[model samples]
Target: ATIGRISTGSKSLDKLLGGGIETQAITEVFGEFGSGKTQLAHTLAVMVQLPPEEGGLNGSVMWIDTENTFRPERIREIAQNRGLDPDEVLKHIAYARAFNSNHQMLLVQQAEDMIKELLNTDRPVKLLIVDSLTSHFRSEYIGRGALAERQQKLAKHLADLHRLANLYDIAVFVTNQVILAHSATLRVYLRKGKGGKRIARLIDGEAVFSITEKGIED
Candidate 1:
C-alpha cells in the first residue's frame, strides 16, 4: 500500500517535505529548545481539521501528549485566529497524556482500540501525533551503560506506532528531542542510533524545526 504524504501544516514545510504528510507512515520532527516543534504540532492540529482544498484532510487529529504540551486554549486561539470554528475543530481533536514510558507504550499499543471507542461510529481518524516521543525514555534512561535496554524499549515503542499507522491507515506525526552537540556546526542527532538504528530506519521522513517570530513556521 502507498504511504500517505506527511503534512507540516505549512505551505513551505509541505514543499520541503516533498508534499503533505505521508499516509500510513511515521514522520519524525526533532529540534532543540524553542525550535517550533510544538508550535508546528499545534498548527497541524488546526490545519488538519481544514478541508482538503485548503491543504488539510478535514478529519480529526489524535494527539498523545507525553510532555503535557497539548493545550486546548492555545488550539482554540489558533483556530479562532484562522477563522475556523474553535469548538468544532477542538471537538474533532482528541487529547491524551502519557504518565510514563510503559504507560506511553500502552497508549500507543491500544491506539486503534481507543480511537474506535472514541468514535464508535463511521468517522475517520486521519492523523496521530505524539508530542515529544523521546522525553520519557531520555528521562528514564541515561548514559552508555543503560543504552542497550533503552534502545530495546524504544524500538518496541516505535514498532507499536508503526503497527498503528499501518492497521488504521492514518498518518503518524511524532515529535522528537535532539541531542545537542557542542561541535562547531551544532549538530543534532536522533536518539536511536545505538538503539539499533530502528527509529531512523523506520520513519519515512524527518524534519528539524526552528522557532520564528510569528510562531512555529518550520
Candidate 2:
C-alpha cells in the first residue's frame, strides 16, 4: 500500500512545499533561535487532525518531542483560532519526550510499535514531527575526537526515521538547529554542518523558518 501525504497545516507554507509534504517522505525544517520550528510542528499536529477537505488529514499526528518543546496549551490556542475544536484536536496528537541522546534514538527506533498500538482501531497517523533532532547528539559528543562517532550514530538515527516514514506512509517532519558563523564585519551567518548535514541529506525537502509575534509565521 502507498504511504500518506503530509501537509504543513498552513496553506501558504503548503504551497511553498509543492502543495503538501510528500507521503512517506522526510522533510526537514531548520533555522536559528526563535525560528518557530516548534510552533510549526505544533500547528501541524492540530492541522493534521482535520479532514482533507478542511486542509488536513482528519487523522492523527505522532509527535516525538526531543527538546521538551511540545506545548499543548499553545497548540490549543492555534486550533481555536483556526476554527477547530481545541480539545478534540489535541486528542489526535500523541506525544513522547526524549530525555537524552540514547533515549531519543531508542524512541525513533521503536516508534512503529507505539504507533501501531495507538492506531490499532484504524485511526491512522498522518504525520510525525521531531522537534530539534541534533540537540542531544551535538551536546553529548562535543569534541573533534567525537565527530566521526557522532555522525555515524546520527546517521543511523535519521535512517531509522526515514524507514519508519516509508513503512508507515506518514509524513516525517524534523526540525534542526543551525550554528552561526561570524563574518569579518561581526555579522553572523547560519550554517548546517556535521550531524545536521546527515539530517539534511536524508530528508526529501527542507525549509528555513523565521519566528514572528504572530507565531511561526514562516
Candidate 3:
C-alpha cells in the first residue's frame, strides 16, 4: 500500500528530501552530538499526528530509544506547541529501551508485534525511530578482532529493519552517531556548523535548520 510521503517537520529539508520522507523505506539520519538528530525524530513523531493535507500521515510512532535518552518532556515540548496535548501525544508513541545490541535487535522483533497490534486498532504505527542506531554496535564491537563480527551482525540487523519496512509498508527512521554499514534507502547526513547551525544533506542537496520547541520550521 502506498501511504505517500511523510514530513520531516522541516519544509526546506522536506524539499531536499524530494517532498518529505518516503513512507515505505528506511531513512538514515546521521550526525554528531548536539546535531539535533534525536530532536528531529521527536519532531517527526508529533508531526505524524497531523493530517495528510498538513504534510503528515495522521498516524502514531514507535520509537526505539537505544541510548536511554528518550525524554517525555522533549516530546511534550514539541507536542504542546503544535496544539496537541502532551499526555495524549506520549500515549500515541510506543517506546522501547534497547539495552544492548542484542537486546536492541530483539526490541525490533517486539516492535513487529506492537505494529501488528496497532494496525488492528484505530491508529496504526507509521514511523519507527531508532535513536542512535549504532550505539550498541559501535560500543560492543571493539577493535579489529570484533570488526568482522560487528559488521555481520549489523548487516543482518539492517536487513531485519528493511524487511520490517517492506512487510508493514511503514516508514523507518534510524539515527546514527557516525556512518557505518547498512542498507538504508535514503541516507541523509547531518552536520553541525558555526553559529549554532544544523545542516542536513543528501546526495542531491542540502538544507539548514535549527532545533526549537516548535520543531524544525522551514
Candidate 4:
C-alpha cells in the first residue's frame, strides 16, 4: 500500500517534508521544554480532520495524554482558526490520561479497540498522538539501575505503536523528552528558532515554523 501524508499545520514545513507526517509509520518529535513539540501535536490533531485536498485524512484522532498537555481549548482555537467547528472537532478526538508507565501502555492497547470500533463509521481513526512519550517511564523508573528494564518496556510499547500504526494505516506522532530514534520511521528534532519560530531538523533536511494561536505556520 502507498504511504499517506498529513499536514503538520505548516505549509512550508510540509513542502520540506515532501508532503507531511507519514501514515502507517511513527514520527518522533523531540526537543527541549517549550520548543513547540506539543504545539505541533496539537496542530496535527486538528489538521487530520481536514480533507485530502486540504492535506488531511478526513478522520478522527486518538490522543494518549501522558503529561496533561492535551487541551480542549487549544483544540478549539486550532479548529476555529481552520474554520472548523470546535465542538464537533472535540467530539471526534478521543482523549485519555495515562497515570503511569504501565497505564500508558494500556491506553495505547485500548486505543486499538477504539480504532476498530470507529473503523466503519464516517470518521475512521487516522492519527495517534502520544505527547511526551518518555515522561511516565522516566519518573517511574528513576536511577540508572532500572535503565535496562525501562528500555525493554519502552521498546515493547513502541512495538505496539508501530503495529497499530501499520495495521490501521494511521499516523503516530510521539513527542519525546529524550531508543526512540531507532524506532521511528522519521525523527524530527525540534528546537527554538529565531523570531519566536521553531526549527525542525530531520535526517535529510530542516524546516522552520511559527506557533500562532491559529496553530502552526511558515
lDDT of 3 by residue, 109-213 (tens): 889988888876766888889987889898989997787899899888888898888888778999988634567898888998777768998842579887777
**Using Cα atoms with residue i matched to residue i, what is each candidate's TM-score against the true structure?**
0.78, 0.78, 0.94, 0.95
Higher-TM-score candidate among 1 and 4?
4
- How do all the candidates rank in terms of lDDT, highest first? 4, 3, 1, 2
lDDT of 4 at 214: 75
Where does candidate 4 stray beyond 4 Å? Answer: 179-181
Error of 4 at 99 (Å): 0.2
Q: What is the C-alpha lDDT of each candidate?
A: 0.66, 0.66, 0.84, 0.89
Q: Give residue 129's lDDT in candidate 3 (0 to 100).
A: 90
Top candidate, metric TM-score: 4
Worst 10 residues of 2 by lDDT: 180-189
lDDT, candidate 1, 1-218, per-residue tens:
56555355455556655677665667776656545567777877777777767766666888899887788877887788777888988898878899988898888876777666644344467788888788998899898776777778877887787777777767777777663311111112233223122121122244333333322344
Candidate 2 lDDT tens digits, 74-105: 77887887777889878878788989989988
Which prediction has more favorable lDDT, 3 or 4? Answer: 4
lDDT for predicted candidate 3 compared with the true structure: 0.84
Which portions of model 2 show Cα errors greater than 4 Å?
118-122, 179-218
